[PDB]
């Protein structure tokens, strides 16, 4: 058309990553450390550039972390709900939660 | 309860949705006129749905709002056609109850060969003294929380007053 007016029309869809963004994430038993660490490098080959691989300190997909997590579940501040855990703070009317359940 | 809580009929509203304007409606206003003695008003259309026979601002229905002593006697005749019998789905969750009657003559109207075949709709608004404070203009407010009408609080007043009962449905 001679570039007399060249605004592209869409095709495909892309996603951006910043330095430190987390592309892909896997959950597994603690005995499968090696199965995770190398399956990801198997995945690493289908991506431009280079990505570091390390095993997180965060229990599961939760916001909360390594082996202090089992205390709070026992301490009754978190409760397991499906793929995640609800934080039970104290600003909520816990005198109407403890009255409901200790 | 105490003297400041006695339940009363704030108002009672009657209407006929005749469906199409012209003559059948302007006959219908007579039926209400024969009943309560107050000049009724015609309610036009809010929307136009052609699967009824209605047009925008076509005069569809005539309604009325009786009040006070006049209301209570109209309810006495109105309830009698239903022989003081109702159901537990006739009492709204906001403390109102209603019903209908299939023919106008059953209240005390006199049939005439010029009169058509009309029914009409009943609906009773309970209330307690102080419920006008939600309408005042100079200074307004809410109605309350323990002074409102629950679902049950409507039924137990109705049952004792007009002797009737409610058949579960």
């Amino acid at each position: 058309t001679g570039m007399r007016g060249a605004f592209g029309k869409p095709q495909g869809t892309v996603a951006r990553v910043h330095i430190g963004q987390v592309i892909m994430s896997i959950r597994t038993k603690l005995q499968n450390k090696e199965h995770v660490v190398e399956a990801l490098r198997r995945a690493k080959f289908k991506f431009p550039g280079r990505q570091k691989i390390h095993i997180s300190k965060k229990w599961g997909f939760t916001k909360f972390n390594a082996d202090e997590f089992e205390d709070m579940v026992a301490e009754k501040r978190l409760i397991p709900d499906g793929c995640g855990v609800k934080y039970i703070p104290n600003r909520g009317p816990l005198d109407k939660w403890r009255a409901l359940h200790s | 309860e105490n003297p400041m809580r006695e339940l009363r009929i704030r108002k009672l509203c009657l209407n006929i949705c005749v469906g199409e304007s012209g003559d059948r409606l302007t006959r219908a206003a007579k039926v209400l006129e024969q009943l309560t003695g107050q000049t009724p008003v015609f309610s036009k259309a809010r929307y136009t749905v052609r699967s009824f026979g209605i047009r925008r601002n076509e005069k569809i229905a005539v309604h009325c709002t009786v009040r006070g002593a006049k209301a209570e006697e109209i309810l006495e005749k109105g309830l009698k056609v239903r022989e003081y019998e109702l159901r537990k789905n006739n009492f709204s969750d906001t403390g109102n109850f209603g019903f209908g009657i299939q023919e106008h003559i059953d209240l005390g109207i006199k049939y005439d060969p010029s009169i058509g075949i009309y029914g009409l709709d009943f609906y009773v608004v309970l209330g307690r003294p102080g419920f006008s404070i939600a309408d005042k203009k100079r200074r307004t407010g809410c109605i309350g929380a323990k002074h409102r009408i629950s679902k049950e609080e409507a039924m137990r007043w109705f049952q004792q007053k007009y002797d009737g009962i409610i058949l579960p449905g």
Binding site: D95, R98, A99, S102 | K137, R138, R139, T140, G141
Partner: protein
């Protein structure tokens, strides 16, 4: 069920009205126009006649607004009328006129223009004129300040107005709302008004109940008969009052009592009485749940 209207987000996105309109007492559309001065009249105050009716009292005030709060030049409550010679009926139309007559007289007696600007004693069909001398006594003015803007011929607030103008104030108005104004002929009458202004309709009302039924009469006016006031003296009592208001418009501001620091509901609960008590209150309600 369907989504609740009041979410945690709904409150975040809220916008309270101005407080006085939230309680419903002040109209902030009829204040922008009935209060604000123009900017080339820099500090010349603008006076309003705040006339309010309550279930058992009539309030009249004259005010001019400031950048912080209002300024009240004078006020004449209607429940001081037992002082002057009238006892029964303060929400009467005539009672309002007794208020509007006093408010002017007390205000004018403050400012030294009491001896002048008197107007008619009792007839209301005309405006009342002024004189202006620069930096010297003359030509008072104000504007009517109705509350929730209800204004239909015969309204009680227009009892004060005819009182104000006859009192000595000059209020721009029109005799289009004095009761007795025929709604469809648009004529000055001043006679039906003269009865309304003097309470002669109430005196007719009790003469109306006399013929028909005393039993209904007792239910209505049980405290007219207490400290007996019969219809035949009704206009006579008021004629004394309008005379009475003139000689003694001044106010003396009866003195107040001495406080023993009373409180009957509960103390004003501050941070500590909140912080420590409620930190207990949990530790108390906590104790019940571990004991059962």
């Amino acid at each position: 069920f369907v989504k609740v209207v009041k979410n945690k987000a709904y409150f975040k996105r809220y916008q309270v009205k101005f407080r006085r309109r939230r309680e419903g007492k002040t109209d902030y559309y009829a204040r922008k126009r009935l209060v604000i001065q123009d900017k080339n009249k820099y500090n010349t105050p603008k006076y309003r006649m705040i006339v309010r009716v309550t279930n058992r009292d009539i309030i009249c005030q004259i005010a001019y607004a400031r950048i912080e709060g209002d300024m009240i030049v004078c006020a004449a409550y209607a429940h001081e009328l037992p002082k002057y010679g009238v006892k029964v009926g303060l929400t009467n139309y005539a009672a309002a006129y007794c208020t509007g007559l006093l408010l002017a007289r007390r205000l004018l007696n403050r400012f030294g223009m009491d001896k002048i600007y008197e107007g008619q004693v009792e007839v209301t069909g005309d405006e009342y004129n002024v004189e202006s001398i620069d930096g010297q006594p003359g030509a008072f003015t104000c504007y009517l300040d109705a509350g929730l803007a209800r204004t239909t011929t015969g309204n009680k607030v227009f009892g004060a107005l005819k009182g104000a103008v006859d009192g000595g104030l000059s209020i721009p108005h029109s005799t289009k709302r004095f009761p007795g104004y025929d709604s469809e002929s648009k004529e000055f009458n001043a006679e039906v008004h003269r009865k309304h202004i003097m309470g002669q309709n109430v005196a007719d009302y009790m003469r109306y109940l006399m013929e028909e039924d005393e039993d209904a009469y007792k239910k209505q006016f049980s405290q007219y008969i207490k400290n007996n006031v019969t219809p035949d003296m009704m206009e006579e009592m008021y004629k004394k009052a309008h005379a009475a208001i003139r000689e003694n418009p001044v106010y003396e501001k009866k003195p107040k009592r001495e406080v023993k620091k009373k409180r009957w509901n509960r103390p004003k609960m501050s941070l500590a009485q909140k912080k420590d008590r409620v930190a207990q209150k949990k530790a108390s309600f906590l104790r019940a749940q571990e004991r059962a």
